[PDB]
Design a protein around this ligand. Structure first.
Ligand SMILES: *[C@@H]1O[C@H](CO[C@@H]2O[C@@H](C)[C@@H](O)[C@@H](O)[C@@H]2O)[C@@H](O[C@@H]2O[C@H](CO)[C@@H](O[C@@H]3O[C@H](CO)[C@@H](O)[C@H](O[C@H]4O[C@H](CO)[C@@H](O)[C@H](O)[C@@H]4O)[C@@H]3O)[C@H](O)[C@H]2NC(C)=O)[C@H](O)[C@H]1NC(C)=O
Ligand SMILES: *[C@@H]1O[C@H](CO[C@@H]2O[C@@H](C)[C@@H](O)[C@@H](O)[C@@H]2O)[C@@H](O[C@@H]2O[C@H](CO)[C@@H](O)[C@H](O)[C@H]2NC(C)=O)[C@H](O)[C@H]1NC(C)=O
Ligand SMILES: *[C@@H]1O[C@H](CO)[C@@H](O)[C@H](O)[C@H]1NC(C)=O
Ligand SMILES: *[C@@H]1O[C@H](CO)[C@@H](O)[C@H](O)[C@H]1NC(C)=O
Length: 471
């Protein structure tokens, strides 16, 4: 049967029993960190014929051959890879050979056969028969051919049974083990598979087949599998799923059905049943199976554990990246200021709306609030003591807010307070008021002219600080 998604086997060999019914592993297979006992015997899963992504064996000892486990693995489709590799075999102690003696096609990605001290029967395999892109294989740290002394079936008596290819200007016999030769097909068949008796398969059959010229006798499909048939494409009203099979809509619509997911569910876009809409699309309603183009960066509501996000750096604003709506409060408190105003804007420039309030305090690094490039509205659903939506205090260099000519912003509810911005002419402050519609909701210690703009050419008034500021 089909088992998915990626099976992750490890620490106990006995976990390899999770694989006893799988004929197809829809996803990857990981076998790490296991140690088979020389004492205890062994498993063997002849049912496994296909793995839709990659096969990765890492740091496993006691296993002396993979054909021992998967004597019938025939295709590793490589629909998703472990970093370019469809087949990774690393630090596999004891492994004396690959033995994957029915492996006939790695549809995608390459292979990595690294530090396997005793691995042999390695130079005797013709990976170009199995893989296209052999140039990308990565091989090193295995057992040296001259110490291996491999002999293909027949070599020792005197009736070679294996075929010969040339690999790296060496013309020799190809085989997976001493008793098993690598299978090849009659040239007649061309780019097609063939039976055990060298009979060509249907052009759709991938890997191999039970009866020639029959598209229902495949061991795998070249393209898509469907209703017992290797199809060259999915039939109308059935959709590609996982790169290898066609599934109808109620199947797609019922995939998380054994689970209580609060997430938006599977969608069907461009003929494929997939868990999520394509990059610039959005589901046209919540839990609709239909994806529609966003028409700009897709809407994205960001909301964190705490209510007030305090951005005290450029690194701290990382999470804001991509967001259109910040549900919470922004406390922008940036002191250190190389040039964080273009860096910040690649993080905060997309925010159109803040649901809470915006507090700018101690932000000496800043000269303008213009990196909030998309901010169109502040909702004021939560406000500082006093009823403040917009609160700006102790800002040494702030010269402007936003450009009150090139830009528009609105404060649905709440009011503002300004203090201790020496480079910030009250004029801007007075303009912002008109624009945001917060004009008229302001007390008058709010916009003081004694410590706001005091040291900037402009064009409770002549004092630097006052009792009015202790309020
Ligand atoms: C999300 O998208 C689905 C799928 O719709 C398809 O893709 C969309 C992205 C868009 O391209 C659609 O045009 C396309 O179908 C939407 O499902 C469709 O939903 C509409 C909603 O009513 C259905 O159409 C209706 O069919 C009725 C029965 O035949 C017909 O009576 C209706 O006509 C009456 O109402 C219309 C609509 O307002 C009116 O203009 C007419 O004059 C008349 O009074 C109406 O056409 C489609 O059949 C849909 N179903 C399917 C299976 O495709 C889905 O609604 C949408 N979700 C959200 C939240 O928008
Ligand atoms: C391993 O198997 C694939 C199977 O081919 C598929 O079916 C073809 C008829 C074609 O339409 C492809 O899309 C399918 O992948 C081999 O790769 C295909 O090779 C054919 C012929 O070279 C080529 O036209 C396709 O583009 C290839 N398909 C893909 C996805 O690349 C591949 O060559 C086989 N590897 C070896 C060593 O034989
Ligand atoms: C597989 O099937 C057998 C019998 O149907 C069952 O006992 C075993 O628990 C199953 N293993 C899995 C992983 O399904
Ligand atoms: C292929 O083989 C199956 C069973 O042997 C058969 O029933 C099906 O009809 C065959 N396909 C053709 C085209 O004959």
């Amino acid at each position: 049967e089909i088992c998915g998604p990626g099976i992750d086997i490890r620490n106990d060999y006995q976990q390899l029993k999770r694989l006893e019914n799988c004929t197809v592993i829809e996803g990857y297979l990981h076998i790490l960190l296991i140690s088979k006992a020389e004492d205890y015997r062994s498993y063997r899963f002849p049912k496994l014929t296909v793995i839709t992504e990659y096969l990765l064996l890492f740091r496993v000892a006691g296993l002396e051959s993979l054909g021992d486990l998967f004597p019938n693995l025939t295709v590793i489709r490589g629909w998703k890879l472990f970093y370019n590799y469809a087949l990774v075999i690393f630090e596999m102690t004891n492994l004396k050979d690959i033995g994957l003696y029915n492996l006939r096609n790695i549809t995608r990605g390459a292979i990595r056969i690294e530090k396997n001290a005793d691995l042999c029967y390695l130079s005797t395999v013709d990976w170009s028969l199995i893989l296209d892109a052999v140039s990308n294989n990565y091989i090193v740290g295995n057992k040296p051919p001259k110490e291996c002394g491999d002999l293909c079936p027949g070599t020792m008596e005197e009736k070679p049974m294996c075929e010969k290819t040339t690999i790296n200007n060496e013309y020799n016999y190809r085989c997976w083990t001493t008793n098993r030769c690598q299978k090849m097909c009659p040239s007649t068949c061309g780019k097609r598979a063939c039976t055990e008796n060298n009979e060509c398969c249907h052009p759709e059959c991938l890997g191999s087949c039970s009866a020639p010229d029959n598209d229902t006798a495949c061991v795998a499909c070249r393209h898509y599998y469907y209703a017992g048939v290797c199809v060259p494409a999915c039939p109308p009203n059935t959709y590609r799923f996982e790169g290898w099979r066609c599934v109808d809509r109620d199947f797609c619509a019922n995939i998380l059905s054994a689970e209580s997911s609060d997430s938006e569910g599977f969608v069907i876009h461009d003929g494929e049943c997939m868990q999520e809409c394509p990059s610039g699309f959005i589901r046209n309603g919540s839990q609709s199976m239909y994806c529609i183009p966003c028409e700009g960066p897709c809407p994205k509501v960001c909301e964190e554990e705490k209510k007030t996000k305090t951005i005290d750096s450029v690194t701290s604003a990382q999470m804001l990246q991509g967001c259109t709506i910040f549900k919470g409060n922004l406390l922008i408190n940036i002191r250190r200021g190389n040039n964080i105003a273009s860096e910040l804007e690649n993080f905060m420039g997309l925010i159109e709306v803040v649901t809470g309030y915006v507090k700018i305090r101690h932000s000496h690094a800043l000269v303008s609030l213009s990196f909030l490039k998309n901010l169109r509205l502040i909702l004021g659903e939560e406000q500082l003591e006093g009823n403040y939506s917009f609160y700006v205090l102790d800002n040494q260099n702030l010269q402007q807010l936003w450009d009150w000519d090139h830009r528009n912003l609105t404060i649905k509810a709440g009011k503002m307070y300004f203090a201790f911005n020496p480079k910030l002419c009250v004029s801007e402050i007075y303009r912002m008021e008109e624009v945001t519609g917060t004009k008229g909701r302001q007390s008058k210690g709010d916009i003081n002219t004694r410590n706001n703009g005091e040291r900037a050419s402009c064009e409770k008034e002549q004092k630097l600080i006052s009792e009015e500021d202790l309020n």
